[PDB]
Design a protein around this ligand. Structure first.
Ligand SMILES: C[S@@+](CC[C@H](N)C(=O)[O-])C[C@H]1O[C@@H](n2cnc3c(N)ncnc32)[C@H](O)[C@@H]1O
Ligand SMILES: [Mg+2]
Ligand SMILES: [Zn+2]
Ligand SMILES: [Zn+2]
Ligand SMILES: [Zn+2]
Ligand SMILES: [Zn+2]
Lengths: 133, 514
């Protein structure tokens, strides 16, 4: 009877319904973008000092004049659609930590976390960028 | 501002979630972290080390267009094209009472097939590390009419079991019949929600080690499965569904079902609900008569049955004309001229409810009912060949489908009638002895008037072209064998033959006079 606490805005319904059922959620999302569908919104956006490391995974928000900061779980697709995580057992990386995105690419924080991997050396975004390699 | 779904509505009884990390959304992070339409990290007020929050799966609401991905809801038209890919689907359910509130779990699933699968209440619970799919405390709905759900709480069954049993139960039912699945449901919300458990979705795929499109999916080892050749498969790759109620029905399902079909009474069991949904779809679509523009591919051996059917038709109506020498023949249910015996002296009149437009000049537009028409043809013989009616007149030759026989051709229907599909599916009324009360059953016989020409056999039953001898005559002995085979084929096909009682095998002998 609700009788509950509403976690979601209608604008994200179809996308989230779509990726929930999909065998490959990741593809389904990128595909859905191509179709002209809107990128997932409502992710948690951090008011920040914006002086800090550019590191993607941080225990407290760390941002740059270029970067913006988001609560990790809201930026993770698997956390967001409440489906199992690609890591075989069982755990998500982004949950419990803040995640930083380039402002230009900040429109779709959810996909950004899918597309890219952090470099193991400096613990920073690869190519967006990295002094390593 | 602003609107909310709620879909993935947080059903936990916790006040004050959720830390801005380990918060799925801005909507829930405690007011304490929110300022100026934003969120901010306060190290002082910590994220929870342990929490369990039930997430509601209700209101899935999926309408989307992606090139590689098929629409899983279909037009009424497209739903006719594929029939008995049709399965009625309804899920009774339960509420989570204890550590959460405000969502419905899928207690008992039911289908057009008599089967009912009951499951342990389980749901999706968010935790610090991940989302987990787990058993949940739950209670039955309040009503006295829901009092029957209580025992089902304990009984069974793990979902890993149920979603595997579901596939096989669908598998052996749809294996020969169709390439796909379509779900027929009355009010689609909860069943869509229920579907989340046993269904994964994606772009079309072909069966591993097989040609046909893949119905099933296996998480155990990634594979895409055929309807037939799958086994031990948990998930259903690409189901289709159609919501009947979307068709503008006035009332509740039971009212509309019971209007037409009385063979299904209602026990609240999920199946008995999921069947009723099918009758309606059947009736609404198929009791409208014989749209001829629809082509359903055939498997199998209907062609043989079709040829055999016509073949036996010719034989019996030719003889019945010879033996009793009728002046006129009223052929009822013949949309096209198409005399079965092409050459006969007899006056041949056609009657049909839906005469084909061209070639409609010959035919009288008529709907036969014994009540009205018992008088109206007193003369000659009447022929109803697969024209299913109010009880037949005393003078007639009739072939009728006996619905009671099951073969992959005929599908269940309303009420007690089976919808028969060879081509151009014909819904036929339930088989009734009383309909034949004026007639008698039709014994097998063979008739050939021909000049005569591996082991030979003697048949007491026939008119042989030559009976003076044994007498096995190599042309007839073979033709008799071939005809009987085509007769036994269509009698196994579920057709039954009935004749006016005046008819006698003997009178065909006098045609052998000279
Ligand atoms: C009887 S079925 C096919 C059988 C067909 N007579 C044959 O042997 O090919 C299709 C036709 O049945 C006719 N039909 C069904 N019920 C009828 C009725 N009560 N009165 C007249 N025609 C009927 C329809 O009008 C329709 O054209
Ligand atoms: Mg239902
Ligand atoms: Zn995650
Ligand atoms: Zn690096
Ligand atoms: Zn196969
Ligand atoms: Zn019924």
């Amino acid at each position: 009877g609700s009788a509950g606490n509403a976690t979601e805005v209608p604008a994200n319904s179809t996308v989230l319904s779509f990726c929930a059922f999909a065998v490959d959620p990741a593809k389904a999302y990128k595909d859905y973008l191509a179709s002209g569908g809107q990128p997932i919104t409502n992710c948690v956006k951090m008011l920040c000092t914006h002086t800090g490391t550019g590191q993607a995974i941080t225990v407290t928000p760390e941002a740059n004049m270029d970067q913006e900061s988001f609560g990790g779980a809201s930026c993770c697709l698997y956390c967001r659609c409440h489906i199992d995580h690609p890591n075989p057992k069982g755990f998500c990386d982004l949950k419990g930590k803040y995640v930083q995105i380039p402002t230009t690419c900040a429109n779709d924080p959810v996909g950004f976390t899918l597309r890219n991997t952090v470099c193991t050396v400096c613990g920073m975004w690869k190519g967006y960028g990295c002094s390593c390699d | 501002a602003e609107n909310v779904t709620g879909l993935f509505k947080d059903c936990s009884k916790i006040i004050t979630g959720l830390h801005p990390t380990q918060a799925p959304t801005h909507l829930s992070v405690d007011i304490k972290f929110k300022t100026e339409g934003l969120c901010v990290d306060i190290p002082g007020i910590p994220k929870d080390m342990t929490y369990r929050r039930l997430i509601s799966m209700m209101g899935f609401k999926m309408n989307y267009q992606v090139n590689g991905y098929p629409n899983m809801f279909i037009t009424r038209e497209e739903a006719i094209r594929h029939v008995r890919a049709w399965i009625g689907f309804d899920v009774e359910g339960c509420h989570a009472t204890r550590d959460a509130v405000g969502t419905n779990l899928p207690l008992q699933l039911g289908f057009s097939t008599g089967v009912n699968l009951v499951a342990v209440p389980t749901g999706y619970v968010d935790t610090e590390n991940n989302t987990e799919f787990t058993r949940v405390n739950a209670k039955p709905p309040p009503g006295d009419q829901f009092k029957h759900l209580i025992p089902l709480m304990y009984k069974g069954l793990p979902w890993n079991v149920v979603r595997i049993k579901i596939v096989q139960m669908l598998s052996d039912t749809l294996k020969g019949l169709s390439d796909r699945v379509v779900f027929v449901l009355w009010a689609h919300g909860f069943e869509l929600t229920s579907m989340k458990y046993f269904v994964k979705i994606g772009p079309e795929r072909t069966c591993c080690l097989c040609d046909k499109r893949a119905t099933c999916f296996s998480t155990s080892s990634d594979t895409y499965a055929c309807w037939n050749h799958s086994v031990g498969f948990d998930y259903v790759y690409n189901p289709f569904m159609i919501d009947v109620q979307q068709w503008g029905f006035t009332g509740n399902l039971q009212s509309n079902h019971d209007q037409h079909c009385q063979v299904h009474g209602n026990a609240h069991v999920a199946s008995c609900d999921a069947i009723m949904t099918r009758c309606l779809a059947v009736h609404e679509c198929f009791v409208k008569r014989v749209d001829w523009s629809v082509e359903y591919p055939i498997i199998g051996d209907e062609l043989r049955v079709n040829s055999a059917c016509r073949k036996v038709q010719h034989m019996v109506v030719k003889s019945a004309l010879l033996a009793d020498k009728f002046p006129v023949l009223h052929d009822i249910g013949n949309p096209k001229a198409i005399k079965c015996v092409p050459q006969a002296e007899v006056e041949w009149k056609f009657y049909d409810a839906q005469p084909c437009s061209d070639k409609a000049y010959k035919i009288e537009e008529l709907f036969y009912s014994y009540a009205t028409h018992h008088d109206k043809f007193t003369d000659g013989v009447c022929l109803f060949w697969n024209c299913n009616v109010d009880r037949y007149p005393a003078n007639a030759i009739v072939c009728r489908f006996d619905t009671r026989v099951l073969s992959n051709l005929n599908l269940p229907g309303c009420d007690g009638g089976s919808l028969y599909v060879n081509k151009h599916a014909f819904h036929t009324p339930a088989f009734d002895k009383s309909a034949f009360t004026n007639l008698k059953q039709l014994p097998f016989f063979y008739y050939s008037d021909s000049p005569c020409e591996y082991v030979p056999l003697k048949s007491a039953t026939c008119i042989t072209r030559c009976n003076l001898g044994g007498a096995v005559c190599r042309h007839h002995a073979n033709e008799y064998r071939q005809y009987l085979d085509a007769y036994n084929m269509m009698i196994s096909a579920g057709f039954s033959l009935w004749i006016y009682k005046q008819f006698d095998t003997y009178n065909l002998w006098n045609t052998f006079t000279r």
